[PDB]
């Protein structure tokens, strides 16, 4: 829910909304969501924000066929 | 250049008199054609054979009588006056000094350039049993004009009554793919390796096809945009395949009605 | 030659040609415009830019705006003035990117891909079978003799 | 190509070849100086007394050195800049035709200003304006890219040379050989 | 139509109804229908049949069967699509409306299990008219995709 709202969101912004533990705890949990291809995003540790890798425009691929 | 259009009546009529004379492979039949050569598209509406005699051991020996040609032209004026002599044909696959030297003989009675024709009796390969060849004075070379087969409304269907979908249409596609393969490999291997003929005049036209997986890999990125129309065709077809379920669901009422009547 | 030069004219020698030879341009009697020299270096310069910029689209597909100012002998503000007049009058069309300073061709998308650009592939496969099929007999004539 | 017509002595063949040489110096049309090699012109003359100008310009296109040919000629043809301008054009026309089929086997159409810079021995600024001059004369059709430093040009004018494209014309048909099986068998099975 | 003189057809001349297809003239309809039985003179018994030899058989198959596709291959596939480029996109869209507009008219008669609009031949009208329309869409879908497919880089 929080990933679809903000494409680029800070690491500490997730812990404020969901009242999580710390930044190292959410860093592990977000990595679990893209395991099966659900969220399809990437985590930038040096930049400090999680960016979504989905540009849509999937019609150019073979998925419609 | 010019174009050639020959009706199917002319092509098969030339093959009939070949067997009627019991002509073997050592002999060949020569004849004349009629039509209108004035326009850019040469049309052949008629053909007549000739008593052609040739020696098999000498290419300089031939028998051609123009008196039969002069009489033939006078006999045609009483049948069809709109037809004039546009050239002459001949049989046999081989081209020897007999058919090459007589090309100027028919030129006296033909206003345009006589159109040479090789009628294949065995019909070996592809289509077009007869090839239309034209000669130039400037060096002489035999060039083939875009010969096509076309007739009138009653003439095209007339042979259909005497002779008498998607997968079949694709069968002819593979035959054209092997035509690209077999024509280039056999010809190119003859120019290279052993026995180089005088060439590089034709090579300029051959490589003119290859420049424009024979075509272009530079559009591969743009091809996906060209493929989009193909993907669009599957958008509606998915419903078209579902449109077959419309009748499939309506036809369910028929059998359900049969169970009620039963 | 000046009329045909507009295709290949880079406007590098433009002030040199007018200065060396000035029959009708800078020094003239009949059909002499301007007070002295001022209207000759303006009206003539405005025309040669229109003729030069017209063929740039047909030659340069993507050109840097910094380089475009050197070919047309203009600046960043002066270049946008002449190109806007040709587009408004329906002469040519191109791309002008102000922050990135990139001038592209901007090929129109009305071709719709397969509906246009693919129709030019007919002569590619039309000259293959039709040509070689005509040269089958010629191959046996040259080698057979 | 005509042996019987235009029957002249041996001394007049060198004078006729001299007019053929100076005529091709001032223009690039109709192939290049190598066109007269296969024709009975360069083979009927002598390799000395300044009759080798046609042979010297054959290898000068690949080497790209104007000083070699300029030292073997006189002041008459060397005082006109057109000789040096159209000579450098034939040097580029060989490279401009490498975008479709010359060297690259994959038929990938690409050209960069760095590759043509080493071939024409010119900097990156001069090669940008030089490509436009070749297209404006009606040689080939295409455009370039200054942003990504790329040159996109097709192939039109044929050449007289052979042996470079012979192997590829068969190699491009090898890709057709592997395509006879999969679609040949599956279509007949339907 | 041929003709054979019967001379005197009154009594005991010869038997025409033997060779092939005789005793025609059912009711008043024979050919143009004005001849009926007597035809021209004493029932000349028109019969005509054709024949083909070995050379004429292979000639017609390589020249004209339905249309002439021989002599050239990939042009008939491309030129049919190229001339129809703007048409195919139009014909798919134009026939798309007329396909449902027929389905939105006659099909509404039969809805519930009972009778409402009293459909009789209406459910069979849109079935037969749109039967080929759904088939033509699948044909042009393979042709448009097939020509651009098959190698050609």
Curated annotation (Swiss-Prot), chain A:
Modified-residue entries (Phosphoserine), positions: 61
Superkingdom in the source lineage: Eukaryota
Post-translational modification: N-acetylated by NAT1.
Subunit annotation: The 26S proteasome is composed of a core protease, known as the 20S proteasome, capped at one or both ends by the 19S regulatory complex (RC). The RC is composed of at least 18 different subunits in two subcomplexes, the base and the lid, which form the portions proximal and distal to the 20S proteolytic core, respectively.
Function as written in the Swiss-Prot or TrEMBL entry: Acts as a regulatory subunit of the 26S proteasome which is involved in the ATP-dependent degradation of ubiquitinated proteins.
Family label: Belongs to the proteasome subunit S3 family.
Additional notes on this entry: Present with 16700 molecules/cell in log phase SD medium.
Protein name: 26S proteasome regulatory subunit RPN3
From Swiss-Prot, chain B:
UniProt xrefs under InterPro entries: EIF3F/CSN6-like_C (IPR024969), JAMM/MPN+_dom (IPR000555), MPN (IPR037518), MPN_RPN7_8 (IPR033858)
Pfam families listed in its UniProt record: JAB, MitMem_reg
Post-translational modification remark: N-acetylated by NAT1.
Single annotated GO MF: metallopeptidase activity
Gene Ontology process terms (BP): proteasome-mediated ubiquitin-dependent protein catabolic process; ubiquitin-dependent protein catabolic process
CC terms in the record's Gene Ontology section: proteasome complex; proteasome regulatory particle, lid subcomplex; proteasome storage granule
Superkingdom, natural source: Eukaryota
Keyword annotations of the record: Acetylation, Phosphoprotein, Proteasome
Residues in coiled coil: none
CDD domains: MPN_RPN7_8
Boundaries of every MPN domain copy: 4-138
Protein family per UniProt: Belongs to the peptidase M67A family.
Function: Acts as a regulatory subunit of the 26S proteasome which is involved in the ATP-dependent degradation of ubiquitinated proteins.
Note: Present with 19800 molecules/cell in log phase SD medium.
Record protein name field: 26S proteasome regulatory subunit RPN8
Organism the protein comes from: Saccharomyces cerevisiae (strain ATCC 204508 / S288c)
Taxonomic classification: Eukaryota, Fungi, Dikarya, Ascomycota, Saccharomycotina
Curated annotation (Swiss-Prot), chain C:
Miscellaneous remark of the record: Present with 5710 molecules/cell in log phase SD medium.
PTM summary: N-acetylated by NAT1.
Gene field: RPN5
Family in the record: Belongs to the proteasome subunit p55 family.
Name this protein carries in UniProt: 26S proteasome regulatory subunit RPN5
Chain ranges of the PCI domain: 1-110
Purpose of the protein: Acts as a regulatory subunit of the 26S proteasome which is involved in the ATP-dependent degradation of ubiquitinated proteins.
Curated annotation (Swiss-Prot), chain D:
PCI domain segment(s): 1-158
Superkingdom of origin: Eukaryota
Function: Acts as a regulatory subunit of the 26S proteasome which is involved in the ATP-dependent degradation of ubiquitinated proteins.
Family stated for the protein in its record: Belongs to the proteasome subunit S11 family.
Further remark: Present with 12400 molecules/cell in log phase SD medium.
Protein name, per record: 26S proteasome regulatory subunit RPN9
Protein's organism: Saccharomyces cerevisiae (strain ATCC 204508 / S288c) (Baker's yeast)
